Design a protein around this ligand. Structure first.
Ligand SMILES: Oc1ccc(C(c2ccc(O)cc2)C(Cl)(Cl)Cl)cc1
Ligand SMILES: Oc1ccc(C(c2ccc(O)cc2)C(Cl)(Cl)Cl)cc1
Lengths: 224, 224
């Protein structure tokens, strides 16, 4: 099938471990600290991953950063969603960090994680494939609606290249549903909704000052 | 072209006036009161409009209400966006209520209205047509991601009927851009983002208790 899809598949990063501190008592602070630490290390990996997206590294450094600062939470959430597809009512942040309903309540994350589980439920019904996941991550990056883009036409071209890849993949692989590409695009509003609420929630956690956060995570959070 | 598109065009409601009270001194309270009053009357019109969407009135009353309670702000915002396309840096809430940057600041709405103006700017560049506007309003209703749907398959069918209408319209009217339907769908995340922030902002206004709000507006706000 589509070469851009095959290229994004081979550019997919390796799995990352959460490594919750086994000496620390379980608490809401421990869970939130573990999650923000894992997100910080995933952000490093996402920045390296984006350089494999056709045309991304030819953008100005400012435009690369603007796209990443607008899309980072959507990309992180799509990752947890994909890792969770073979599970029931659980979110697989990492192989060693899987959150059920009880742990979400203890962490103060029940409402947020239930929205993420709504995304999981929709993608399970659609039988989301890895090929479609990696293409949607790239589309979410290009379509992230930053207010600070210098070269709008170049960013629109990036959107178009990745949208064409999705369209071509679905036309060849899913002839039984001539509307599958559009159905995939119609899942992006819920992804944006859930990311918007997550950034809000964790900005409030940043303000309360009880959860330590690393430099890169704080930079992405303080942009938004 | 497409019959569903032509049907939605003839079902389009007539324009509504804001009628700000000419005896009341200008203030943030007056602007917010005027806007919420206008929204309340537009909501009545939207409920009547939705009954013209193929299949909508065959849904259970609960599912009709769930879709409307999830989508109402997106539908209202898409309306102001469309009315504003021929203007520059102004939002046309009604023919008699056009807000520029200064009035947005006075009302406390600068950040929200700048996001709405980002939507306007994108649709201006795409040369959004009335045919595409009315179809996107219907898609936003069907795709609103309520957590309370009884008949999920029927709602998915409604999404599919309207998505097909958009696809067919673009295939016949815009052969120069075989990706225009998808580009239209890719504008829905920003619409969802802006609606999510608007509901937040006006819920806070509801809590402060200084702006009177009518029954239907309050019902929609208190659902969300
Ligand atoms: O309930 C939630 C917990 C963590 C997250 C995020 C998250 C998302 C994806 C990850 O792979 C890691 C953390 C942040 Cl970035 Cl906010 Cl800590 C989102 C929702
Ligand atoms: O800066 C804004 C002001 C009013 C609105 C809304 C609005 C949107 C569309 C309308 O036709 C009327 C009001 C509500 Cl519903 Cl929040 Cl009052 C949205 C953003």
């Amino acid at each position: 099938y589509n070469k851009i899809v095959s290229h994004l598949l081979v550019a997919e990063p390796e799995k990352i471990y959460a490594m919750p501190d086994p000496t620390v008592p379980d608490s809401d602070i421990k869970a939130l600290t573990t999650l923000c630490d894992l997100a910080d290390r995933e952000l490093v990996v996402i920045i390296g991953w984006a350089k494999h997206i056709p045309g991304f590294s030819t953008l100005s450094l400012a435009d690369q950063m603007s796209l990443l600062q607008s899309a980072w939470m959507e990309i992180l959430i799509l990752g947890v969603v994909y890792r969770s597809l073979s599970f029931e009512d659980e979110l697989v942040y990492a192989d060693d960090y899987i959150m059920d309903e009880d742990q979400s309540k203890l962490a103060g994350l029940l409402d947020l994680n239930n929205a993420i589980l709504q995304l999981v439920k929709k993608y399970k019904s659609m039988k989301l494939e890895k090929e479609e996941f990696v293409t949607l991550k790239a589309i979410a990056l290009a379509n992230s609606d930053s207010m600070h883009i210098e070269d709008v036409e170049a960013v629109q071209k990036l959107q178009d290249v990745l949208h064409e890849a999705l369209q071509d993949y679905e036309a060849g692989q899913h002839m039984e549903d001539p509307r599958r590409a559009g159905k995939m695009l119609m899942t992006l509003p819920l992804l944006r909704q859930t990311s918007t609420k997550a950034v809000q929630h964790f900005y409030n956690i940043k303000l309360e000052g009880k959860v330590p956060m690393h430099k890169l995570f704080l930079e992405m959070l303080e942009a938004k």
